[PDB]
Design a protein around this ligand. Sequence first.
Ligand code: CLA
Ligand code: CLA
Ligand code: CLA
Ligand code: CLA
Ligand code: CLA
Ligand SMILES: CC1=C(/C=C/C(C)=C/C=C/C(C)=C/C=C/C=C(C)/C=C/C=C(C)/C=C/C2=C(C)CCCC2(C)C)C(C)(C)CCC1
Ligand code: SF4
Lengths: 80, 743, 143, 73, 73, 73, 157, 42
Amino acid sequence: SHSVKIYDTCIGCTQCVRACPTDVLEMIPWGGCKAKQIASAPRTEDCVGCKRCESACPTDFLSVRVYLWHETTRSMGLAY
Amino acid sequence: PEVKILVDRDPIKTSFEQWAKPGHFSRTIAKGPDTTTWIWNLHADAHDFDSHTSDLEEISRKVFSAHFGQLSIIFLWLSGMYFHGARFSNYEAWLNDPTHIRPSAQVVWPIVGQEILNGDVGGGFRGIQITSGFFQIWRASGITSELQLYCTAIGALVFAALMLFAGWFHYHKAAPKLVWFQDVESMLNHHLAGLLGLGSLSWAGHQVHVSLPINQFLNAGVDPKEIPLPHEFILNRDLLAQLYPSFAEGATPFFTLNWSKYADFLTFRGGLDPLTGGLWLTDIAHHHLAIAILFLIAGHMYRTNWGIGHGIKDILEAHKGPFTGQGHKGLYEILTTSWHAQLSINLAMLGSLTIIVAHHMYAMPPYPYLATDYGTQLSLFTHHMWIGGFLIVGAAAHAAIFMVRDYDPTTRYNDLLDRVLRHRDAIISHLNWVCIFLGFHSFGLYIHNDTMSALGRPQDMFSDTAIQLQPVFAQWIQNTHALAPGTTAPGATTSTSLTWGGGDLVSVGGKVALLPIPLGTADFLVHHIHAFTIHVTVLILLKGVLFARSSRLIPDKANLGFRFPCDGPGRGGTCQVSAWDHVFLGLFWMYNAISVVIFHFSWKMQSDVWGSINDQGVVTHITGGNFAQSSITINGWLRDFLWAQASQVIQSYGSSLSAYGLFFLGAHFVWAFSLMFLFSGRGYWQELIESIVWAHNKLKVAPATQPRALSIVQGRAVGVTHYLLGGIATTWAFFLARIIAVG
Amino acid sequence: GFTPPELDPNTPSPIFGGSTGGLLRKAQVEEFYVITWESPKEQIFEMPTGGAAIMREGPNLLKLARKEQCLALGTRLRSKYKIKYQFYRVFPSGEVQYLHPKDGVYPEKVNPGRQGVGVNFRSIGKNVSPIEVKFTGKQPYDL
Amino acid sequence: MFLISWRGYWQELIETLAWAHERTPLANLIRWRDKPVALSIVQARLVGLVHFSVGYIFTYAAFLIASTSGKFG
Amino acid sequence: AALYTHHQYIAGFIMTGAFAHGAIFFIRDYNPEQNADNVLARMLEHKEAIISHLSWASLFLGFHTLGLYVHND
Amino acid sequence: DFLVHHAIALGLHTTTLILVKGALDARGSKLMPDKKDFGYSFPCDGPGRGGTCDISAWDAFYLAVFWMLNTIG
Amino acid sequence: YQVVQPINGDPFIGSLETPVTSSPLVAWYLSNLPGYRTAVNPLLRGIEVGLAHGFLLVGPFVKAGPLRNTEIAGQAGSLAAGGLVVILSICLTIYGISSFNEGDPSTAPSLTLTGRKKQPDQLQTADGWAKFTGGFFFGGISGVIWAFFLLYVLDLP
Amino acid sequence: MRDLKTYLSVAPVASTLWFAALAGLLIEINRFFPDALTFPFF
Ligand code: CLA
Ligand code: CLA
Ligand code: CLA
Ligand code: CLA
Ligand code: CLA
Ligand SMILES: CC1=C(/C=C/C(C)=C/C=C/C(C)=C/C=C/C=C(C)/C=C/C=C(C)/C=C/C2=C(C)CCCC2(C)C)C(C)(C)CCC1
Ligand code: SF4
């Protein structure tokens, strides 16, 4: 299972959650930004590691990060 | 319903304002550059019409006028060829003695010592020997003075200006609408009966009145200046009736149906002309007559405006059975709404046609004095093989584009496409297997042979002396083609080609034009190598097409486009899943297959076909005939073909062939230069550009359009482009230097 | 707090002709997935494995082999059509698992009953150097 | 090969082959214990580079020894 | 000839490894705060000026060497 | 001897450039400022930010081996 | 009417039905082979296997090997086929060793083509696979012996 | 006409003209002073 971490520079634009192809991410309420929103990653046992979320984040530097880690059946994307 | 002209007036206005605003066609480019990447995108998307807009009418208008531009360019290139034949050539002297003067239609200025490239090509002339075979065409045409070449250069220039004007006109003043383009029945009726029928009829006419009599006079020995002008043959007809008595009755037979009385100049001989080493002109005229009749009839199949004819939709809907469901229902709607489907079918057919042209033109030489001009024959075969391969690969590219951007079962459903999509797994499995099996049983034999020859065990080889693998069917078929004239073709005298056999050999000027080509174990091995390479190329391209929309690995691939780098390093890594990357990979394998084809043909022709014959009649081939015994190992290809024939090009420094020696080395350089783009990635390059940019910033000399490294896809594309250029140019220099040097 | 629906078998399936892209041995021994939706009428749609199928008017129940397949099909169903879908994970035991949407709302909309998983309260430039975590099994981003 | 062709193409090919095998009679009585997958990205680079430099050393060694030993001078 | 080529090629591999373990050291075991403002951190502090001048030198040599060889050819 | 010695100098300078850049950028650069959190060797950082193929320091080593082989050649 | 149908009406299994995979002649044939005789002792099936394959593997090693023309050694090249039988039965043994354990049931399917339960095929055991191994090997070596026994001239020795 | 003056100053056309003129200049220099290996003046 890969690791996905959210950092407090997040502006809560939700662009990363819209992009995930396996539904790893989620929005949760917060108080540190104008959107009162922050991303979370509750379901990292399904993450294929495509970094489609990182291409979508606009902050500099990134607010979502994907660290590739130990591989499994779901992580490798095997249908057999 | 009915067919008519449909046009709009003044759709776009002629202006310069859009020239000064780069990237007007795409909204993203129009905005202007921030980084250098912009400049690349501007060129990559320049002719992607159906991506600049959504409207089919606009795409078709652009395509039509772009075609006019291409035709104008081709006419300008023809104009140049004829003008150079007329002005800077030795064509007249070659016309006087064709088997001693080697043709040349390009001279160079004496600027930095480069005038050494103006070599002694015979006839009181010094220049560059050409290999396009234009003198042979101009002789087969009847052209005998440079004034006719001037005239055709001027006519071609006029036609090029005309094409350019029509290209402007049909886009800016009178632009046809979609319903005009989407009428395929009338289009096919015109191209079948009007372009190909009337074309070959008119050409048969020219051969009957100009080429035939002027070539009769030339082969009789008459001085090329004392031959009458062609139009004389038309004004005075007794001139024609002296060479062909049948021209006295003059179209009375063609009506009295006694076509027999034309047997004078419309023959069915077969074989070559033993004076010039080409096909009988009386055969070619009759051929063109027959082809014109066939096409003129075939251009009356489809219904346009008078009931009679065939509806394409009806033909397609009628065909279906118990294995294919409803098949062919729904292909007329597809083949009339996507340009990419049409382009794929057309490219496939044109590439295959070019390869067939290569084979038929070596085996049954059409022009006079072409068969004994070895450099021209090699050049033509090789050129046309390369063109055919490239077009076939483009066919796959545009089938993939159709699958990603146009296929849509919600509004245009076809059954056969759906069923192939539903068993693509079995398809790709079986093709994969057959390529592995074919690769083991052809290259493996070579490896067995090399190892048995190095282990001092030649009786254990796969060869004509130890373990024979004779292609029985090929030998059987060419034996049937030998016995054909008189048994299954009573109307023919000689058989279609001299390669079939019968013991007939044709010579010209002490050179060998043609003779029977022998098939043996080596021919068997080479042909199975060829089957292997073609199967592999097919596997790569068809895998790219069939899985362009989705996979078990990436189930929504169509949403990422047709040309994307990857879908990230996850799932194990997904570099090069797009169909563009499959085209990119198939280009290398096409290069491999065509290269082996042209090596096989080049070595075989010198070894068993080309050479010199003696008055006593003993043929000495250019190479000694070593293809039967040295082609069966890899060491024989490295030693007896590459090392032994590169001598001509590595020894041209100081002669007039030194440009080939320079291009040999330049092409090696460009090939090795591409590996840098192919083996690396853009992260390294952007990080190096960072420090270089720092150095520029230190001196207030840094540019405002921020430099970036190339794209991932651009890296791949630059890599394959330089790889192909380097390799093909190396073989070009090798071939031309070698063949020009010996003869 | 949003009881999730149950899996109702005997729910019909779309009209398909069969294809070599469907389930394999992994669905026999490891796991597979099931998606269900509504389909106001019968309509054609592109299978996420092969060609085209016809979804029936009323509930629809498809069995696929990967979560990504279900989610790509659901994205297609939710935007191009206006359809609500749910999918589940079935084990070889005969055990179902409602999967998505987890708490009844789509994850791109913030719901007040969610906790934060994997959130660091600092910028990404404030991770320690690897030398700080050497010989102990944590990772610099673990904190 | 390993240096110009990259991973995705090969992984899709392997999925096709796995289907083919699992579907054929008398041969699906045999079951692998590791699911076959294409090589890794870094792994492919390493394997390509290894082939490249092995070929390098071997061809040059053969030529150098044969062209000095053949003349022995 | 054999000895010379063997020892030069082994020296080249050893050089590439000598430089690889420097990057491994910089990633794994380097501690910034414990090397504050000494020769090592100073090397890190003007990496642009080192890379830019190496780049200039190698551009210059490549341009003029290949140019003179092509002139002569 | 003059010309080939300048070719040798070009080779040494370019191999040094590759290896030194790989070493001095292994803790992070502008295109990836947190590279040290990823290890010595890793494939890429996906196709975002323009694309990051071959950005690890292992990859600089892998590129430099080609130039080493060319130089010793 | 159409000829191809989804496997047993289920259009979401990754396969199809054709005249190649589900046809009465093919079904009956493939059914009456050793590997598909579920209700039979593993060793008998293995015996059939080894017999047929030793006999088949005789020919090529004889008519193609290095001593094909030397016939003071041409015919006795059955040594090679015996060695090949030995090698791939060693491979059979290690495959069975790694794929199974005696204290575990046999992984074969328990359902049949119509939806009735079957007693799992015992060839997929550890025990029965070792039994089948012995059968195949016995048959292979003695089939090599048999097809070497028929050295009498026929049409092509 | 002004748009044409702008277009003629776009990068590819400007470089084309610049280098064609430079090429003519070097070509004519070498046609007048051929085979120079040194500065033979002072
Ligand atoms: C024959 C193949 C080849 C060539 C010519 C080069 C050349 C170069 N490499 Mg490279 N490399 C190669 C293969 C090659 N490489 C391979 C196979 C790999 C492994 C993937 C690498 C990996 C690599 C790396 C990692 C790096 C280089 C670098 C460099 C540059 C070094 C600086 C220099 O020498 O100044 C210039 C030398 C030249 C030979 C340039 C020649 C081209 C001239 C200018 C032609 C002039 C054009 C002329 C006007 C006509 C144009 C035609 C028109 C149609 C455009 C240089 C341009 C380094 C670099 O970027 O330095 C800063 C660098 O970091 N290379
Ligand atoms: C590295 C060690 C090695 C050795 C010692 C041999 C030895 C031999 N090889 Mg071989 N080979 C090798 C590596 C080796 N090979 C590799 C790596 C390859 C792959 C490229 C090949 C590919 C190869 C081929 C394609 C062929 C040989 C053949 C032969 C035999 C030729 C001489 C002969 O006719 O004998 C006498 C003739 C005999 C039939 C002797 C048979 C040997 C006994 C009787 C077999 C008994 C086996 C035994 C039950 C158990 C098997 C091994 C066990 C100890 C584990 C010979 C015994 C040829 C051959 O004869 O085929 C058999 C031949 O066709 N080799
Ligand atoms: C006898 C009628 C006729 C003829 C001879 C042609 C001939 C041609 N068509 Mg065309 N076409 C026709 C009818 C005809 N068409 C009809 C009825 C339709 C649909 C209504 C189309 C729709 C069509 C399309 C969409 C396209 C063509 C294209 C082409 C060119 C194909 C490429 C080629 O082989 O170039 C061979 C080159 C030559 C033979 C050189 C000689 C060129 C001569 C002068 C052509 C003149 C024929 C033309 C019909 C004259 C009418 C113009 C007149 C009003 C002044 C070719 C010249 C392609 C094209 O336009 O390229 C620009 C293409 O895109 N045609
Ligand atoms: C009738 C032939 C034909 C036509 C009309 C098209 C048309 C089209 N193609 Mg296509 N294609 C063809 C044949 C054709 N192709 C063939 C034969 C191949 C196999 C190689 C391909 C493979 C192909 C691919 C892979 C792609 C297209 C794409 C496209 C679209 C955009 C092209 C573009 O503007 O890029 C811009 C054109 C350039 C940047 C010019 C490139 C210059 C080349 C690389 C240099 C060649 C060197 C030169 C020959 C000699 C060296 C000179 C130098 C030394 C000075 C366009 C609709 C693209 C697409 O996305 O489709 C939607 C796409 O990516 N084609
Ligand atoms: C005394 C010398 C020395 C020592 C002790 C080490 C020690 C170490 N190195 Mg290192 N290195 C060295 C020299 C040395 N290196 C040199 C000379 C180079 C330049 C080539 C490198 C470049 C290098 C890199 C790029 C990396 C290391 C890594 C490592 C660490 C783990 C290596 C490992 O086990 O991976 C496993 C060992 C292998 C995979 C070797 C098997 C594959 C080899 C290359 C194939 C051999 C070729 C073939 C079999 C022979 C020909 C075939 C036949 C036909 C003849 C380890 C602490 C790695 C690391 O983990 O980072 C810390 C790392 O990425 N080294
Ligand atoms: C005696 C004599 C002389 C002198 C000499 C001299 C003066 C010397 C030298 C020399 C030198 C002076 C050399 C050198 C070299 C060097 C090198 C080759 C280097 C290196 C480095 C590296 C490889 C690095 C690594 C790293 C990194 C990257 C980072 C981290 C750390 C480390 C360190 C790990 C003469 C000749 C005059 C004369 C005779 C006598
Ligand atoms: S960025 Fe490059 S290396 Fe990384 S996955 Fe994409 S194509 Fe592969």
